[PDB]
Amino acid sequence: LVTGGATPELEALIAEENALRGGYSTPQTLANRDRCRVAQLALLDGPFADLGDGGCYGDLFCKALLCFGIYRLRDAHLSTPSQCTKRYVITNPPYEFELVPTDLIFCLMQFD
Protein backbone atom coordinates (compact mmCIF):
# COMPACT_ATOMS: atom_id res chain seq x y z
CA LEU A 1 0.00 0.00 0.00
CA VAL A 2 2.82 2.41 0.99
CA THR A 3 6.00 1.49 -0.96
CA GLY A 4 3.98 1.00 -4.20
CA GLY A 5 5.83 -2.16 -5.44
CA ALA A 6 6.72 -4.63 -2.61
CA THR A 7 6.38 -7.81 -4.82
CA PRO A 8 8.59 -11.00 -4.71
CA GLU A 9 10.25 -10.23 -8.10
CA LEU A 10 11.23 -6.65 -7.14
CA GLU A 11 12.63 -7.93 -3.81
CA ALA A 12 14.69 -10.57 -5.68
CA LEU A 13 16.13 -7.98 -8.15
CA ILE A 14 17.16 -5.40 -5.51
CA ALA A 15 18.63 -8.21 -3.34
CA GLU A 16 20.80 -9.28 -6.32
CA GLU A 17 21.77 -5.87 -7.76
CA ASN A 18 20.82 -3.03 -5.28
CA ALA A 19 19.61 -1.00 -8.36
CA LEU A 20 16.81 -0.72 -10.97
CA ARG A 21 17.82 -1.71 -14.45
CA GLY A 22 15.43 -0.26 -17.07
CA GLY A 23 13.60 -2.70 -19.41
CA TYR A 24 11.34 -2.78 -22.50
CA SER A 25 7.51 -2.71 -22.16
CA THR A 26 6.72 -6.37 -23.07
CA PRO A 27 2.96 -7.09 -22.59
CA GLN A 28 3.46 -9.12 -19.35
CA THR A 29 5.70 -6.28 -17.99
CA LEU A 30 3.10 -3.67 -19.04
CA ALA A 31 0.28 -5.65 -17.31
CA ASN A 32 2.04 -4.98 -13.92
CA ARG A 33 0.92 -1.27 -14.14
CA ASP A 34 -2.68 -2.31 -13.24
CA ARG A 35 -2.70 -1.61 -9.49
CA CYS A 36 -4.86 0.61 -7.27
CA ARG A 37 -3.64 4.05 -6.03
CA VAL A 38 -4.73 6.17 -3.04
CA ALA A 39 -6.61 9.42 -3.83
CA GLN A 40 -8.81 12.17 -2.31
CA LEU A 41 -12.05 13.24 -4.08
CA ALA A 42 -13.94 16.53 -3.55
CA LEU A 43 -17.55 16.02 -2.32
CA LEU A 44 -18.86 19.57 -3.18
CA ASP A 45 -18.43 19.02 -6.99
CA GLY A 46 -18.93 15.75 -8.95
CA PRO A 47 -21.29 12.75 -9.40
CA PHE A 48 -21.22 12.23 -5.59
CA ALA A 49 -22.26 15.87 -4.83
CA ASP A 50 -26.00 15.00 -4.50
CA LEU A 51 -24.90 12.63 -1.69
CA GLY A 52 -22.62 15.55 -0.59
CA ASP A 53 -25.72 17.60 0.44
CA GLY A 54 -27.93 14.43 0.78
CA GLY A 55 -25.94 13.95 3.99
CA CYS A 56 -25.49 10.11 4.37
CA TYR A 57 -22.42 7.86 3.67
CA GLY A 58 -24.21 5.65 1.13
CA ASP A 59 -21.15 3.81 -0.22
CA LEU A 60 -21.26 3.56 -4.02
CA PHE A 61 -18.73 0.84 -4.84
CA CYS A 62 -20.60 -0.15 -7.99
CA LYS A 63 -18.97 2.72 -9.87
CA ALA A 64 -15.40 2.72 -11.20
CA LEU A 65 -14.51 0.13 -8.42
CA LEU A 66 -13.22 2.02 -2.56
CA CYS A 67 -13.77 4.67 0.11
CA PHE A 68 -12.18 4.23 3.56
CA GLY A 69 -12.33 7.61 5.38
CA ILE A 70 -13.26 11.33 5.58
CA TYR A 71 -11.02 14.46 5.78
CA ARG A 72 -13.31 16.84 7.76
CA LEU A 73 -12.56 20.52 8.64
CA ARG A 74 -11.92 21.01 12.43
CA ASP A 75 -14.60 23.77 12.54
CA ALA A 76 -17.25 22.13 10.25
CA HIS A 77 -19.41 20.68 13.10
CA LEU A 78 -20.50 24.17 14.32
CA SER A 79 -22.83 26.85 12.88
CA THR A 80 -20.50 29.90 13.23
CA PRO A 81 -18.08 30.79 10.38
CA SER A 82 -14.30 30.41 10.70
CA GLN A 83 -11.16 30.99 8.55
CA CYS A 84 -9.64 27.61 9.54
CA THR A 85 -8.73 25.28 6.62
CA LYS A 86 -7.22 22.48 8.80
CA ARG A 87 -8.84 19.03 8.38
CA TYR A 88 -8.76 15.95 10.64
CA VAL A 89 -9.06 12.30 9.57
CA ILE A 90 -12.09 10.08 10.28
CA THR A 91 -11.26 6.41 9.46
CA ASN A 92 -14.17 4.00 8.69
CA PRO A 93 -17.26 6.14 9.56
CA PRO A 94 -20.62 4.28 10.11
CA TYR A 95 -22.89 3.60 7.07
CA GLU A 96 -25.43 6.09 8.55
CA PHE A 97 -22.71 8.77 9.18
CA GLU A 98 -23.85 12.41 8.77
CA LEU A 99 -21.62 13.92 6.04
CA VAL A 100 -21.34 17.63 5.02
CA PRO A 101 -20.64 19.17 1.57
CA THR A 102 -17.16 20.50 2.61
CA ASP A 103 -15.76 16.94 3.13
CA LEU A 104 -12.98 15.18 1.19
CA ILE A 105 -13.02 11.35 1.08
CA PHE A 106 -10.06 8.92 1.08
CA CYS A 107 -10.41 6.21 -1.59
CA LEU A 108 -8.54 3.56 -3.61
CA MET A 109 -8.81 4.27 -7.37
CA GLN A 110 -8.48 1.68 -10.14
CA PHE A 111 -5.92 2.02 -12.89
CA ASP A 112 -7.47 3.19 -16.25
Add this chain to the structure above:
Amino acid sequence: LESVSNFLKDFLHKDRDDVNVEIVFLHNISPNLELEALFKRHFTQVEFYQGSVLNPHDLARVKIESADACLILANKYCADPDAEDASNIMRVISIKNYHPKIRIITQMLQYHNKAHLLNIPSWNWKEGDDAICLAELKLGFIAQSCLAQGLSTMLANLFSMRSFIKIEEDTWQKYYLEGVSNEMYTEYLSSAFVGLSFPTVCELCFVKLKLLMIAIESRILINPGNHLKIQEGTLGFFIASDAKEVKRAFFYCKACSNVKKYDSTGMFHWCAPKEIEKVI
Protein backbone atom coordinates in the same frame (compact mmCIF):
# COMPACT_ATOMS: atom_id res chain seq x y z
CA LEU B 1 11.19 0.90 30.86
CA GLU B 2 9.51 3.03 28.12
CA SER B 3 10.10 0.34 25.43
CA VAL B 4 8.71 -2.52 27.59
CA SER B 5 5.71 -0.51 28.86
CA ASN B 6 4.84 0.63 25.30
CA PHE B 7 5.26 -2.96 23.99
CA LEU B 8 3.07 -4.52 26.73
CA LYS B 9 0.28 -1.89 26.17
CA ASP B 10 -0.09 -2.91 22.49
CA PHE B 11 0.63 -6.64 22.99
CA LEU B 12 -1.69 -7.34 25.99
CA HIS B 13 -4.52 -5.14 24.76
CA LYS B 14 -8.15 -6.22 25.44
CA ASP B 15 -9.23 -5.50 21.81
CA ARG B 16 -7.29 -8.71 20.92
CA ASP B 17 -8.68 -12.23 21.36
CA ASP B 18 -7.71 -14.70 24.23
CA VAL B 19 -3.90 -14.11 23.99
CA ASN B 20 -2.45 -16.93 26.12
CA VAL B 21 1.08 -16.17 24.69
CA GLU B 22 3.71 -15.82 27.45
CA ILE B 23 6.33 -13.06 26.95
CA VAL B 24 9.98 -13.82 27.82
CA PHE B 25 12.50 -10.95 27.96
CA LEU B 26 16.22 -11.64 27.41
CA HIS B 27 18.54 -8.63 28.27
CA ASN B 28 22.23 -8.42 29.49
CA ILE B 29 21.62 -5.52 31.98
CA SER B 30 19.77 -6.10 35.31
CA PRO B 31 16.38 -4.28 35.41
CA ASN B 32 16.12 -1.19 37.65
CA LEU B 33 13.47 -0.96 40.44
CA GLU B 34 10.91 0.66 38.10
CA LEU B 35 11.24 -2.06 35.45
CA GLU B 36 11.20 -4.81 38.14
CA ALA B 37 7.94 -3.19 39.38
CA LEU B 38 6.51 -3.23 35.81
CA PHE B 39 7.30 -6.99 35.64
CA LYS B 40 5.57 -7.53 39.07
CA ARG B 41 2.44 -5.92 37.59
CA HIS B 42 2.49 -8.57 34.80
CA PHE B 43 3.44 -11.51 37.08
CA THR B 44 1.45 -14.25 35.24
CA GLN B 45 2.24 -13.25 31.61
CA VAL B 46 5.83 -11.80 31.56
CA GLU B 47 9.16 -13.40 32.60
CA PHE B 48 12.64 -11.81 32.54
CA TYR B 49 15.98 -13.66 32.27
CA GLN B 50 19.38 -11.93 32.32
CA GLY B 51 21.69 -12.98 29.44
CA SER B 52 23.04 -12.21 25.94
CA VAL B 53 21.42 -12.93 22.53
CA LEU B 54 24.98 -13.62 21.23
CA ASN B 55 25.45 -16.63 23.61
CA PRO B 56 23.91 -20.02 22.56
CA HIS B 57 23.66 -21.07 26.24
CA ASP B 58 21.38 -18.11 26.96
CA LEU B 59 19.32 -18.83 23.82
CA ALA B 60 18.92 -22.40 25.20
CA ARG B 61 17.92 -21.07 28.65
CA VAL B 62 15.11 -19.03 27.02
CA LYS B 63 13.96 -22.13 24.99
CA ILE B 64 14.34 -20.48 21.51
CA GLU B 65 13.90 -23.92 19.84
CA SER B 66 10.21 -23.87 20.99
CA ALA B 67 9.44 -20.10 20.87
CA ASP B 68 6.65 -19.08 18.44
CA ALA B 69 8.67 -16.01 17.39
CA CYS B 70 11.62 -13.84 18.46
CA LEU B 71 11.13 -10.03 18.54
CA ILE B 72 14.15 -7.65 18.34
CA LEU B 73 13.52 -4.02 19.45
CA ALA B 74 15.84 -1.25 18.13
CA ASN B 75 17.11 1.95 19.77
CA LYS B 76 15.50 4.55 17.37
CA TYR B 77 17.34 7.46 19.07
CA CYS B 78 20.91 6.04 18.95
CA ALA B 79 23.88 8.31 18.07
CA ASP B 80 24.82 6.13 15.02
CA PRO B 81 22.14 4.16 13.05
CA ASP B 82 24.82 1.99 11.33
CA ALA B 83 26.20 0.67 14.67
CA GLU B 84 22.63 -0.01 15.91
CA ASP B 85 21.64 -1.83 12.68
CA ALA B 86 24.93 -3.75 12.66
CA SER B 87 24.20 -4.81 16.29
CA ASN B 88 20.67 -5.98 15.40
CA ILE B 89 22.11 -7.84 12.36
CA MET B 90 24.39 -9.66 14.82
CA ARG B 91 21.40 -10.64 16.97
CA VAL B 92 19.53 -12.19 14.04
CA ILE B 93 22.56 -14.20 12.79
CA SER B 94 23.02 -15.48 16.38
CA ILE B 95 19.33 -16.48 16.79
CA LYS B 96 19.25 -18.11 13.29
CA ASN B 97 22.58 -19.89 13.98
CA TYR B 98 21.13 -21.47 17.17
CA HIS B 99 17.82 -22.37 15.41
CA PRO B 100 17.26 -21.82 11.63
CA LYS B 101 13.42 -22.24 11.74
CA ILE B 102 12.42 -19.56 14.33
CA ARG B 103 10.34 -16.61 13.03
CA ILE B 104 12.19 -13.31 13.63
CA ILE B 105 10.59 -9.84 13.74
CA THR B 106 13.11 -6.95 13.86
CA GLN B 107 13.27 -3.15 13.58
CA MET B 108 15.87 -1.73 11.13
CA LEU B 109 16.79 1.99 11.00
CA GLN B 110 18.48 2.31 7.54
CA TYR B 111 17.25 0.67 4.29
CA HIS B 112 20.70 -0.42 2.96
CA ASN B 113 21.20 -2.50 6.15
CA LYS B 114 17.88 -4.31 5.35
CA ALA B 115 19.45 -5.57 2.07
CA HIS B 116 22.34 -7.16 4.08
CA LEU B 117 19.71 -8.82 6.33
CA LEU B 118 18.16 -10.92 3.51
CA ASN B 119 21.61 -12.34 2.52
CA ILE B 120 21.43 -14.62 5.64
CA PRO B 121 20.76 -18.21 4.33
CA SER B 122 17.92 -19.14 6.75
CA TRP B 123 16.22 -15.69 6.73
CA ASN B 124 12.94 -16.34 4.89
CA TRP B 125 10.43 -13.49 4.50
CA LYS B 126 8.07 -15.94 2.67
CA GLU B 127 7.37 -17.64 6.07
CA GLY B 128 7.14 -14.56 8.33
CA ASP B 129 10.69 -13.24 8.91
CA ASP B 130 9.80 -9.52 9.11
CA ALA B 131 12.14 -6.53 8.93
CA ILE B 132 10.21 -3.38 9.95
CA CYS B 133 12.43 -0.73 8.33
CA LEU B 134 11.73 2.67 9.91
CA ALA B 135 13.28 4.73 7.06
CA GLU B 136 11.27 2.77 4.41
CA LEU B 137 7.92 2.99 6.24
CA LYS B 138 8.42 6.61 7.44
CA LEU B 139 9.33 8.05 4.03
CA GLY B 140 6.64 5.84 2.45
CA PHE B 141 3.95 7.22 4.83
CA ILE B 142 5.11 10.76 3.96
CA ALA B 143 5.11 9.86 0.22
CA GLN B 144 1.53 8.55 0.33
CA SER B 145 0.47 11.75 2.15
CA CYS B 146 1.67 13.70 -0.95
CA LEU B 147 -1.18 11.97 -2.92
CA ALA B 148 -3.75 12.31 -0.07
CA GLN B 149 -3.10 14.52 3.01
CA GLY B 150 -3.64 12.83 6.41
CA LEU B 151 -3.17 9.28 5.04
CA SER B 152 -0.02 8.95 7.23
CA THR B 153 -2.26 9.72 10.27
CA MET B 154 -4.88 7.02 9.65
CA LEU B 155 -2.31 4.34 8.70
CA ALA B 156 -0.48 4.99 12.00
CA ASN B 157 -3.83 4.87 13.89
CA LEU B 158 -4.84 1.49 12.28
CA PHE B 159 -1.88 -0.40 13.89
CA SER B 160 -2.10 1.19 17.38
CA MET B 161 -4.47 -0.79 19.68
CA ARG B 162 -7.08 1.61 21.07
CA SER B 163 -10.57 1.42 22.58
CA PHE B 164 -13.42 3.83 21.68
CA ILE B 165 -13.01 6.88 24.00
CA LYS B 166 -16.37 8.71 24.45
CA ILE B 167 -16.52 12.53 24.60
CA GLU B 168 -19.89 14.36 24.79
CA GLU B 169 -18.87 17.91 23.67
CA ASP B 170 -19.30 18.66 19.93
CA THR B 171 -15.60 18.97 18.97
CA TRP B 172 -13.31 17.72 16.18
CA GLN B 173 -12.08 15.25 18.83
CA LYS B 174 -15.41 13.31 19.18
CA TYR B 175 -15.39 12.32 15.48
CA TYR B 176 -11.59 11.74 15.46
CA LEU B 177 -11.74 9.35 18.51
CA GLU B 178 -14.48 7.27 16.84
CA GLY B 179 -12.13 6.81 13.84
CA VAL B 180 -9.12 6.04 16.14
CA SER B 181 -11.06 3.11 17.71
CA ASN B 182 -10.49 1.08 14.50
CA GLU B 183 -7.57 -1.26 13.81
CA MET B 184 -6.69 -3.44 10.85
CA TYR B 185 -7.24 -7.21 11.32
CA THR B 186 -6.64 -10.33 9.16
CA GLU B 187 -9.23 -13.13 8.78
CA TYR B 188 -9.96 -16.11 6.45
CA LEU B 189 -13.15 -16.06 4.32
CA SER B 190 -14.66 -18.94 2.25
CA SER B 191 -18.11 -20.15 3.47
CA ALA B 192 -20.69 -18.30 1.29
CA PHE B 193 -17.92 -15.95 -0.12
CA VAL B 194 -15.87 -18.37 -2.34
CA GLY B 195 -16.27 -17.45 -6.05
CA LEU B 196 -18.26 -14.19 -5.44
CA SER B 197 -17.13 -10.84 -6.99
CA PHE B 198 -14.84 -8.64 -4.81
CA PRO B 199 -17.24 -5.57 -4.76
CA THR B 200 -20.32 -7.70 -3.89
CA VAL B 201 -18.34 -9.29 -1.03
CA CYS B 202 -17.35 -5.81 0.24
CA GLU B 203 -20.96 -4.55 -0.01
CA LEU B 204 -22.41 -7.55 1.93
CA CYS B 205 -20.10 -7.37 4.95
CA PHE B 206 -20.06 -3.51 5.01
CA VAL B 207 -23.90 -3.22 4.69
CA LYS B 208 -25.08 -6.17 6.91
CA LEU B 209 -22.02 -7.47 8.90
CA LYS B 210 -21.24 -3.76 9.77
CA LEU B 211 -17.42 -4.09 9.33
CA LEU B 212 -15.26 -2.21 6.80
CA MET B 213 -14.47 -4.90 4.35
CA ILE B 214 -11.40 -6.36 2.69
CA ALA B 215 -9.13 -3.53 1.50
CA ILE B 216 -7.21 -6.35 -0.25
CA GLU B 217 -7.76 -10.03 -1.13
CA SER B 218 -5.04 -15.01 -4.50
CA ARG B 219 -1.89 -12.99 -3.41
CA ILE B 220 -1.69 -9.48 -1.82
CA LEU B 221 -3.92 -7.57 -4.33
CA ILE B 222 -5.29 -4.21 -3.02
CA ASN B 223 -8.91 -3.51 -4.18
CA PRO B 224 -8.84 -6.01 -7.17
CA GLY B 225 -12.12 -5.08 -9.03
CA ASN B 226 -14.49 -7.33 -11.04
CA HIS B 227 -11.88 -9.75 -12.37
CA LEU B 228 -9.17 -12.03 -10.89
CA LYS B 229 -11.12 -12.88 -7.65
CA ILE B 230 -11.73 -16.70 -7.65
CA GLN B 231 -9.89 -18.40 -4.71
CA GLU B 232 -11.11 -20.80 -1.90
CA GLY B 233 -8.33 -20.53 0.71
CA THR B 234 -7.84 -16.77 0.54
CA LEU B 235 -7.24 -14.28 3.35
CA GLY B 236 -8.66 -10.77 3.87
CA PHE B 237 -7.58 -7.54 5.67
CA PHE B 238 -10.49 -5.77 7.40
CA ILE B 239 -10.89 -2.52 9.39
CA ALA B 240 -12.92 -2.97 12.61
CA SER B 241 -13.31 -1.78 16.24
CA ASP B 242 -11.67 -4.93 17.71
CA ALA B 243 -10.68 -8.57 16.93
CA LYS B 244 -14.00 -9.90 18.41
CA GLU B 245 -15.96 -7.85 15.80
CA VAL B 246 -14.09 -9.13 12.65
CA LYS B 247 -14.76 -12.80 13.64
CA ARG B 248 -18.32 -12.65 12.10
CA ALA B 249 -16.69 -12.71 8.61
CA PHE B 250 -16.42 -16.48 9.39
CA PHE B 251 -19.51 -18.79 9.62
CA TYR B 252 -21.68 -16.33 7.66
CA CYS B 253 -25.25 -17.47 8.43
CA LYS B 254 -27.17 -15.87 5.46
CA ALA B 255 -30.10 -15.24 7.84
CA CYS B 256 -30.44 -11.44 7.80
CA SER B 257 9.21 -1.10 -27.20
CA ASN B 258 12.03 1.12 -28.64
CA VAL B 259 12.88 2.95 -25.33
CA LYS B 260 13.18 1.95 -21.62
CA LYS B 261 10.26 3.67 -19.72
CA TYR B 262 10.20 1.34 -16.65
CA ASP B 263 12.29 -1.02 -14.50
CA SER B 264 12.64 -4.67 -15.63
CA THR B 265 9.46 -5.67 -13.64
CA GLY B 266 7.43 -2.64 -14.82
CA MET B 267 6.69 -1.63 -11.16
CA PHE B 268 8.35 1.85 -11.35
CA HIS B 269 8.91 4.58 -13.95
CA TRP B 270 12.50 4.78 -15.29
CA CYS B 271 14.17 7.02 -17.88
CA ALA B 272 17.99 6.81 -17.94
CA PRO B 273 20.80 7.70 -15.57
CA LYS B 274 20.05 11.46 -15.72
CA GLU B 275 23.00 13.55 -14.41
CA ILE B 276 23.18 15.92 -11.38
CA GLU B 277 24.54 18.83 -13.45
CA LYS B 278 21.38 18.52 -15.69
CA VAL B 279 18.71 18.44 -12.91
CA ILE B 280 20.31 21.26 -10.87
Add this chain to the structure above:
Amino acid sequence: LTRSEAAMTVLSGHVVVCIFGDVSSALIGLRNLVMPLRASNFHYHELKHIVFVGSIEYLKREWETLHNFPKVSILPGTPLSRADLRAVNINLCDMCVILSANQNNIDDTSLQDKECILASLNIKSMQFDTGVNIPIITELVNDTNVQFLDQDDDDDPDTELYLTQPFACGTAFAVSVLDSLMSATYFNDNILTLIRT
Protein backbone atom coordinates in the same frame (compact mmCIF):
# COMPACT_ATOMS: atom_id res chain seq x y z
CA LEU C 1 37.84 -4.87 -14.23
CA THR C 2 34.27 -3.58 -14.62
CA ARG C 3 31.37 -6.07 -13.99
CA SER C 4 30.98 -6.53 -17.78
CA GLU C 5 34.61 -7.70 -18.30
CA ALA C 6 34.48 -10.00 -15.27
CA ALA C 7 31.17 -11.52 -16.53
CA MET C 8 32.40 -12.22 -20.12
CA THR C 9 35.93 -13.36 -19.02
CA VAL C 10 35.98 -17.13 -18.44
CA LEU C 11 37.63 -17.57 -15.03
CA SER C 12 37.82 -21.22 -13.85
CA GLY C 13 39.85 -22.88 -11.07
CA HIS C 14 40.90 -19.42 -9.77
CA VAL C 15 41.10 -17.64 -6.36
CA VAL C 16 38.60 -14.95 -5.30
CA VAL C 17 39.73 -12.74 -2.40
CA CYS C 18 36.99 -10.76 -0.64
CA ILE C 19 38.34 -7.67 1.20
CA PHE C 20 36.53 -5.56 3.79
CA GLY C 21 38.34 -2.23 4.47
CA ASP C 22 38.59 1.54 3.80
CA VAL C 23 41.09 4.50 3.78
CA SER C 24 41.44 4.19 7.62
CA SER C 25 41.84 0.38 7.92
CA ALA C 26 45.29 -1.20 8.53
CA LEU C 27 47.23 -2.95 5.74
CA ILE C 28 46.65 -6.74 5.69
CA GLY C 29 49.88 -7.24 3.69
CA LEU C 30 48.14 -8.98 0.76
CA ARG C 31 51.52 -9.87 -0.84
CA ASN C 32 51.86 -12.61 1.84
CA LEU C 33 48.74 -14.25 0.26
CA VAL C 34 49.93 -13.62 -3.35
CA MET C 35 53.63 -14.70 -3.08
CA PRO C 36 53.06 -18.43 -2.20
CA LEU C 37 50.56 -18.52 -5.14
CA ARG C 38 53.33 -17.10 -7.38
CA ALA C 39 56.25 -19.39 -6.47
CA SER C 40 58.42 -20.39 -9.49
CA ASN C 41 57.83 -24.15 -8.87
CA PHE C 42 54.35 -23.68 -10.44
CA HIS C 43 54.37 -23.85 -14.26
CA TYR C 44 52.79 -20.76 -15.85
CA HIS C 45 49.74 -22.78 -17.14
CA GLU C 46 48.75 -24.34 -13.73
CA LEU C 47 49.33 -20.97 -11.92
CA LYS C 48 45.92 -19.95 -10.44
CA HIS C 49 44.44 -16.57 -11.42
CA ILE C 50 43.74 -14.18 -8.45
CA VAL C 51 40.92 -11.59 -8.28
CA PHE C 52 40.36 -9.10 -5.45
CA VAL C 53 36.81 -7.91 -4.70
CA GLY C 54 36.75 -4.88 -2.38
CA SER C 55 37.04 -1.12 -1.78
CA ILE C 56 39.28 0.52 -4.43
CA GLU C 57 41.07 2.85 -1.95
CA TYR C 58 42.09 -0.16 0.13
CA LEU C 59 43.38 -2.10 -2.88
CA LYS C 60 45.25 0.94 -4.36
CA ARG C 61 47.06 1.23 -0.93
CA GLU C 62 48.25 -2.41 -1.15
CA TRP C 63 49.00 -2.18 -4.93
CA GLU C 64 52.58 -0.81 -4.56
CA THR C 65 53.42 -4.09 -2.71
CA LEU C 66 51.93 -6.51 -5.33
CA HIS C 67 52.04 -4.77 -8.76
CA ASN C 68 54.99 -7.02 -9.85
CA PHE C 69 53.02 -10.33 -9.85
CA PRO C 70 51.51 -11.96 -12.99
CA LYS C 71 47.79 -12.82 -13.48
CA VAL C 72 46.15 -10.56 -10.82
CA SER C 73 42.83 -8.65 -11.28
CA ILE C 74 40.85 -6.09 -9.23
CA LEU C 75 37.02 -5.74 -9.24
CA PRO C 76 36.19 -2.46 -7.36
CA GLY C 77 32.98 -3.29 -5.49
CA THR C 78 31.44 -4.71 -2.30
CA PRO C 79 32.29 -8.40 -1.47
CA LEU C 80 28.68 -8.75 -0.12
CA SER C 81 27.33 -7.67 -3.56
CA ARG C 82 25.68 -10.66 -5.22
CA ALA C 83 26.06 -9.03 -8.66
CA ASP C 84 29.88 -8.67 -8.18
CA LEU C 85 30.19 -12.30 -6.91
CA ARG C 86 28.12 -13.52 -9.88
CA ALA C 87 30.34 -11.58 -12.28
CA VAL C 88 33.62 -13.19 -10.97
CA ASN C 89 32.24 -16.76 -11.54
CA ILE C 90 32.34 -17.50 -7.75
CA ASN C 91 30.83 -20.98 -8.49
CA LEU C 92 33.98 -21.89 -10.56
CA CYS C 93 36.67 -20.76 -8.07
CA ASP C 94 39.18 -23.22 -6.53
CA MET C 95 39.02 -21.03 -3.38
CA CYS C 96 37.15 -18.03 -2.00
CA VAL C 97 39.08 -16.20 0.76
CA ILE C 98 37.03 -13.96 3.12
CA LEU C 99 38.95 -11.56 5.39
CA SER C 100 38.72 -8.07 6.95
CA ALA C 101 41.20 -5.23 7.55
CA ASN C 102 38.83 -3.47 10.04
CA GLN C 103 39.30 -6.28 12.65
CA ASN C 104 40.71 -4.55 15.81
CA ASN C 105 40.35 -0.73 15.36
CA ILE C 106 36.76 -1.17 16.79
CA ASP C 107 36.31 -1.68 20.54
CA ASP C 108 32.80 -3.11 20.21
CA THR C 109 33.95 -6.74 20.58
CA SER C 110 31.17 -8.10 18.31
CA LEU C 111 31.27 -6.09 15.08
CA GLN C 112 34.51 -7.26 13.44
CA ASP C 113 33.53 -10.73 12.19
CA LYS C 114 30.00 -9.60 11.23
CA GLU C 115 30.51 -8.91 7.52
CA CYS C 116 32.63 -12.08 7.09
CA ILE C 117 29.81 -14.22 8.57
CA LEU C 118 27.24 -12.49 6.29
CA ALA C 119 29.51 -12.89 3.21
CA SER C 120 30.03 -16.60 3.99
CA LEU C 121 26.26 -17.03 4.41
CA ASN C 122 25.44 -15.09 1.19
CA ILE C 123 27.71 -17.25 -1.04
CA LYS C 124 26.29 -20.55 0.37
CA SER C 125 22.70 -19.23 -0.14
CA MET C 126 23.50 -18.34 -3.81
CA GLN C 127 22.04 -20.24 -6.83
CA PHE C 128 23.53 -21.14 -10.32
CA ASP C 129 22.42 -23.01 -13.46
CA THR C 130 23.68 -24.80 -5.71
CA GLY C 131 26.29 -22.52 -3.98
CA VAL C 132 26.68 -24.61 -0.73
CA ASN C 133 29.56 -26.70 -2.24
CA ILE C 134 31.75 -23.61 -3.06
CA PRO C 135 35.17 -23.79 -1.28
CA ILE C 136 35.31 -21.02 1.36
CA ILE C 137 38.01 -20.06 3.87
CA THR C 138 37.04 -17.38 6.44
CA GLU C 139 39.46 -15.51 8.69
CA LEU C 140 37.93 -14.99 12.16
CA VAL C 141 39.46 -12.66 14.77
CA ASN C 142 37.05 -13.51 17.63
CA ASP C 143 37.63 -17.22 18.44
CA THR C 144 34.00 -17.84 19.67
CA ASN C 145 32.28 -16.71 16.39
CA VAL C 146 33.52 -19.86 14.53
CA GLN C 147 30.44 -21.83 15.50
CA PHE C 148 28.42 -19.30 13.45
CA LEU C 149 29.83 -20.47 10.05
CA ASP C 150 27.93 -23.80 9.90
CA GLN C 151 24.24 -24.60 10.68
CA ASP C 152 24.34 -28.47 10.54
CA ASP C 153 26.54 -28.91 13.65
CA ASP C 154 26.49 -28.92 17.48
CA ASP C 155 27.60 -25.51 18.84
CA ASP C 156 28.96 -25.12 22.39
CA PRO C 157 30.92 -22.09 23.80
CA ASP C 158 33.26 -24.38 25.86
CA THR C 159 34.43 -26.43 22.79
CA GLU C 160 38.01 -25.43 21.82
CA LEU C 161 38.69 -23.94 18.35
CA TYR C 162 40.59 -27.02 17.07
CA LEU C 163 37.69 -29.40 17.86
CA THR C 164 34.91 -27.39 16.17
CA GLN C 165 33.57 -28.52 12.77
CA PRO C 166 34.34 -25.37 10.61
CA PHE C 167 38.01 -25.61 11.70
CA ALA C 168 38.27 -29.43 11.44
CA CYS C 169 36.96 -29.14 7.83
CA GLY C 170 39.36 -26.26 6.93
CA THR C 171 36.74 -23.51 6.27
CA ALA C 172 37.71 -21.29 9.25
CA PHE C 173 41.06 -19.93 10.53
CA ALA C 174 42.15 -17.68 13.45
CA VAL C 175 45.53 -16.38 14.75
CA SER C 176 44.89 -18.07 18.15
CA VAL C 177 46.28 -21.41 16.79
CA LEU C 178 49.69 -19.77 16.14
CA ASP C 179 50.34 -19.22 19.93
CA SER C 180 51.76 -22.78 20.16
CA LEU C 181 54.60 -21.69 17.79
CA MET C 182 56.30 -19.82 20.69
CA SER C 183 56.82 -23.19 22.42
CA ALA C 184 57.32 -25.26 19.24
CA THR C 185 60.10 -22.93 17.95
CA TYR C 186 61.76 -22.85 21.37
CA PHE C 187 62.20 -26.65 21.54
CA ASN C 188 62.66 -27.26 17.76
CA ASP C 189 65.22 -24.57 16.84
CA ASN C 190 64.84 -24.87 12.99
CA ILE C 191 61.05 -25.46 12.80
CA LEU C 192 60.07 -21.85 11.92
CA THR C 193 62.39 -22.11 8.88
CA LEU C 194 60.61 -25.34 7.84
CA ILE C 195 57.08 -23.88 8.17
CA ARG C 196 58.19 -20.73 6.32
CA THR C 197 59.79 -22.85 3.58
